[PDB]
Design a protein around this ligand. Structure first.
Ligand SMILES: NC(=O)c1ccc[n+]([C@@H]2O[C@H](COP(=O)([O-])OP(=O)(O)OC[C@H]3O[C@@H](n4cnc5c(N)ncnc54)[C@H](OP(=O)(O)O)[C@@H]3O)[C@@H](O)[C@H]2O)c1
Ligand SMILES: O=C(O)c1cc(Cl)cc(Cl)c1O
Ligand SMILES: [Zn+2]
Length: 320
């Protein structure tokens, strides 16, 4: 179960991670219960973000499990993310400090730039003008990264990384004059329909971990995900693999990522499925079965985040 990977800064990340995001209609209380369940089941990597509006609950869950002696703080790998309304250098540490206040934790294990397109500062996560048009902002992401680096210097984040960055954007950070810390990871959509071979190879080449999200084919929340997209977990090949191994399509999709050198997230707010997901460590796939899963690639991106298209930093126009 507890398998970790060494990050490029010498910290360790558990290779299986609990996703904590739920669609807006899901009550906040559910994040609290699910996160406790997840830790009880064996999850030690917990993925959240300021965007998710659940850091009070996830923090409560984590601290409850530390209070009752189930885990120590050093046993939990907790990730947060800097939202698009706090890309300005001077807003970076206040954002992290606000997440920490909400969590009642003294540090996060990992802090990520959530998405490379900036939006106007303020309380609104998606600011719009009086006609409903998104209020984008102009911010040098290299200046953002420098402020994120200072959060590591401060001890407020053990490790730092990025999310939804393309190759060009990784290169921008990596090649920045006076770089202190490379991103330890790039957290991106990744699953058998969209298996990110080119980006995976690039991240590998730069000692950057690829962390897969929507690894089970995504929450499929409208208007974010096209309801007409094929359903990952209904895939005939994943189902046949599941039957052969006495596992589930979900477990096949998870194991796939582990065996290709990808750290993998899995969201569930269902006690049974939470408990089931940690079984990814209990079985293996052959090289032939891995090749079969490689053939499933369809160029299906579930989360285009195309409401943020237009600005130059929109990451998904490039090939990868
Ligand atoms: N950085 C970013 O921009 C970004 C974007 C998307 C996601 N993420 C992160 O990655 C996480 C996971 O991605 P996701 O939220 O799109 O969901 P996901 O992990 O791909 O899972 C999608 C759905 O699968 C169901 N599920 C879970 N285990 C299952 C199983 N064994 N069998 C059948 N169904 C199962 C869940 O429903 P139940 O809850 O009903 O089990 C969940 O709604 C997020 O929660 C978040 O932490 C980050
Ligand atoms: O989970 C996320 O990070 C996420 C981010 C964005 Cl911007 C939108 C949706 Cl629907 C998400 O699920
Ligand atoms: Zn007006």
């Amino acid at each position: 179960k507890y398998q970790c990977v060494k990050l490029n800064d010498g910290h360790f990340m558990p290779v299986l991670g609990f996703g904590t995001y739920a669609p807006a209609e899901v009550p906040k209380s559910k994040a609290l219960e699910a996160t406790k369940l997840a830790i009880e089941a064996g999850f030690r990597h917990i993925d959240s973000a300021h965007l998710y509006n659940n850091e009070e609950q996830v923090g409560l869950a984590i601290r409850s499990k530390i209070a009752d002696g189930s885990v120590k703080r050093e046993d939990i790998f907790y990730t947060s993310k800097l939202w698009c309304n706090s890309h300005r250098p001077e807003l970076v540490r206040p954002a992290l400090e606000r997440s920490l206040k909400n969590l009642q934790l003294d540090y996060v294990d990992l802090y990520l730039i959530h998405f490379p397109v900036s939006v106007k500062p303020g309380e609104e996560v998606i600011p719009k003008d009086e006609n409903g048009k998104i209020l984008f902002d102009t911010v040098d992401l290299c200046a953002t990264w420098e402020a994120v680096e200072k959060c590591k210097d401060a001890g407020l984040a053990k490790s730092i990384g990025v999310s939804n960055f393309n190759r060009r954007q990784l290169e921008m950070i990596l090649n920045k004059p006076g770089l202190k810390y490379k991103p330890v990871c790039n957290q991106v959509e990744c699953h058998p329909y969209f298996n990110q071979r080119k980006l995976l190879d690039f991240c590998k080449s730069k000692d950057i971990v690829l962390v897969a999200y929507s690894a089970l084919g995504s929450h499929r929340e409208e208007p974010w995900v096209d309801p007409n997209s094929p359903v990952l977990l209904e895939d005939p090949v994943l189902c046949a693999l599941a039957k052969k191994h006495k596992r589930t399509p979900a477990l096949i999709a998870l194991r796939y990522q582990l065996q290709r050198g990808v750290v993998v997230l899995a969201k569930s707010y269902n006690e049974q499925r939470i408990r089931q997901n940690v079984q990814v460590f209990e079985f293996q796939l052959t090289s032939e079965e891995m090749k079969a899963i490689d053939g499933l690639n369809r160029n299906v991106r579930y989360l285009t985040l195309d409401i943020f298209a237009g600005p130059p930093n929109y990451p998904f126009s490039d090939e990868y």
